[PDB]
Design a protein around this ligand. Structure first.
Ligand code: K
Ligand code: K
Ligand code: MG
Ligand code: MG
Ligand code: MG
Ligand code: MG
Ligand code: MG
Ligand code: MG
Ligand code: MG
Ligand code: MG
Ligand code: MG
Ligand code: MG
Ligand code: MG
Ligand code: MG
Ligand code: MG
Ligand code: MG
Ligand code: MG
Ligand code: MG
Ligand code: MG
Ligand code: MG
Ligand code: MG
Ligand code: MG
Ligand code: MG
Ligand code: MG
Ligand code: MG
Ligand code: MG
Ligand code: MG
Ligand code: MG
Ligand code: MG
Ligand code: MG
Ligand code: MG
Lengths: 119, 73, 88, 101
RNA sequence: GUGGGAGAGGGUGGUGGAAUUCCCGGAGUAGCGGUGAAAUGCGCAGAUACCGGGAGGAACGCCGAUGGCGAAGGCAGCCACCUGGUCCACCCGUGACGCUGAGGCGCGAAAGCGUGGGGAGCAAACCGGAUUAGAUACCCGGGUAGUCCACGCCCUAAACGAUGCGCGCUAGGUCUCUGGGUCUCCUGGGGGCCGAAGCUAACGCGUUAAGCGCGCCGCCUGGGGAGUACGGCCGCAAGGC
């Protein structure tokens, strides 16, 4: 109930899941999707195919709002990041620019033992 | 890799200790705000060591980026 | 810190004759200067040990020089001590 | 008595009156701490690599002075008291170190 | 002494950006998280993902190295102040003033202790979910001390080059950090690698000796019992010697 037609697509990809938030040019969410939004439940959410399904689902949900062109922002390393990019490539949406915003600290906080041997 | 060009050979004679100069210093930063390594900058030990300092100085003054978003991909 | 003019002042003060830089009196004088200043620095900044080591070393040097001085000429030793107010 | 460089960034949205006031306060505080001003450079307002205090740009001054060491930090602290002042960086002067010579 | 240099050497005060957590607000809705696979857990009192603001603590990405400094422990955002050591040049001054060093005194990672603060993240103990024949564990979810600051204790370690300090002497080559110079190179100081002579049980060491010598200190005398017992000294205790 907006008619935006130009917006941003945030792909957040970890090894456990891939979730895609599509928003207006000011960054306020319109629709979102994930591995779990689609039928997948367990580890299968962290799959590239699941990321394709998530991206496509989010995209069609966005085009329902009348979306046309998006700017893609990628955060996180994991399977299905590039497959989410690849799905969004032609979803019917036009991808304008792709950017990797993945947040990295300047060594502020002590990571969990699993992530250690670093800071 | 990345032997295509070096920053020291690219420009002329410049003061490394001047933090107020953005045009020169921007060349030593990467695509992101990161400071380029030796093989990229072409500088020497002492030179690089000074460049780091003046770059960080400029960063505090709001003249240089601490970090940037990577495009393309 | 210690400027050039202070150092020169004390050097020309304790010299045995004009031109003298490194005679024992001058050395003990300089060492006294640095020791005093450093001790003042250490009254505050009590947590700075690495400088305190420097102090120990300087004191040791001064003591060795003075010991040598009293071994050689006792008169100059009495004079130097009375002048610098060291030892009491 | 050492030679320092004072860096000051102000609010780019300032009108002439308030800006003149700010620079007056800067001069006054400078002389109050006993700093003779060797020279000055007004670079005007420039673009910032990252927003400082919600502003995309900022007004840059520059000073080269000779002042007593003991007061230096205080001087800096003084310049920070103002609300319109964003960044203050006091740097000891140094001979220019060149490259490609 | 004079002139000059490099440096994460130390202490005090400031200050910057990234990120994490929490809080407020916007937009949005059915999950998020996590694993080998899962469950606990969190989420319709609206989470996750996204944007804006705020609060607070801790650590400083790139530079960054095979690098530097320090007696060792150890030291890394940036700015100033206070301060230690050290190297080179000049060949100016004193004229053996030297070396080592039982005992003493000081310093001494982490953990630990005392009093008071602080507490974002992490996390012994603990509380749970899994796995397992069991699982007082590995894996997952929470989580207190603690980790941070001030003052005072504690005195340990694979406190390691497993190599006490100082001086003299004995082929070179190669890379490197930092001075100087008639600057492709020569000459000091430091860090590495390969190697003459020689040493070594061998591995290896080899002008940064584990070579050739001199001086002084510490130490060893088969394994287990045992770094235990007893005594003494130190400590608030743990405990240390
Ligand atoms: K030992
Ligand atoms: K007792
Ligand atoms: Mg999963
Ligand atoms: Mg050249
Ligand atoms: Mg330092
Ligand atoms: Mg909210
Ligand atoms: Mg409801
Ligand atoms: Mg709090
Ligand atoms: Mg050393
Ligand atoms: Mg070590
Ligand atoms: Mg010094
Ligand atoms: Mg002579
Ligand atoms: Mg003579
Ligand atoms: Mg000794
Ligand atoms: Mg200790
Ligand atoms: Mg501790
Ligand atoms: Mg405590
Ligand atoms: Mg746990
Ligand atoms: Mg936890
Ligand atoms: Mg308690
Ligand atoms: Mg070792
Ligand atoms: Mg060599
Ligand atoms: Mg050498
Ligand atoms: Mg060498
Ligand atoms: Mg041989
Ligand atoms: Mg060898
Ligand atoms: Mg026996
Ligand atoms: Mg026995
Ligand atoms: Mg045994
Ligand atoms: Mg024991
Ligand atoms: Mg023991």
């Amino acid at each position: 109930k907006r008619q935006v037609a130009s917006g941003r697509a945030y792909i957040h990809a970890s090894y456990n899941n891939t979730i895609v938030t599509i928003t207006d040019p000011d960054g306020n969410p319109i629709t979102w999707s994930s591995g779990g939004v689609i039928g997948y439940k367990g580890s299968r959410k962290g799959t590239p195919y699941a990321a394709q399904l998530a991206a496509l689902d989010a995209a069609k949900k966005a085009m329902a709002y009348g979306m046309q062109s998006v700017d893609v922002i990628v955060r996180g390393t994991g399977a299905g990041r590039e497959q989410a990019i690849r799905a969004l490539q032609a979803s019917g949406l036009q991808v304008k620019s792709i950017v990797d915003d993945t947040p990295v600290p300047h060594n502020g906080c002590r990571p969990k033992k699993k992530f250690r041997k670093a800071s | 890799p990345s032997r295509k060009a070096k920053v020291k050979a690219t420009l002329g004679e410049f003061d490394l200790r001047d933090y107020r100069n953005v045009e020169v210093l921007k060349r030593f930063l990467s695509e992101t705000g990161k400071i380029l390594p030796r093989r990229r900058t072409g500088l020497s030990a002492k030179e690089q060591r000074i460049l780091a300092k003046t770059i960080k100085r400029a960063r505090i003054l709001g003249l240089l980026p601490f970090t940037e978003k990577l495009v393309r991909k | 810190p210690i400027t050039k003019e202070e150092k020169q002042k004390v050097i020309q003060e304790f010299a045995r004759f004009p031109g003298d830089t490194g005679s024992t009196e001058v050395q003990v004088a300089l060492l006294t200067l640095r020791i005093n200043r450093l001790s003042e620095h250490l009254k505050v900044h009590k947590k700075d040990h690495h400088s305190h080591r420097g102090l120990l070393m300087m004191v040791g040097q001064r003591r060795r020089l003075l010991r040598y001085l009293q071994r050689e000429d006792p008169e100059r030793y009495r004079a130097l001590i009375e002048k610098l107010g060291i030892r009491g | 008595m050492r030679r320092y460089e004072v860096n000051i960034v102000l609010n780019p949205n300032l009108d002439q009156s308030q800006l003149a006031l700010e620079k007056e306060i800067i001069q006054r505080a400078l002389e109050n701490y006993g700093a003779r001003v060797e020279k000055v450079e007004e670079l005007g307002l420039r673009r910032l690599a990252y927003p400082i205090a919600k502003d995309p740009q900022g007004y840059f001054l520059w000073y080269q002075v000779e002042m007593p060491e003991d007061r230096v930090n205080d001087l800096a602290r003084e310049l920070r008291i103002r609300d319109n002042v964003r960044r203050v960086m006091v740097v000891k002067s140094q001979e220019p170190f060149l490259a490609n010579a």
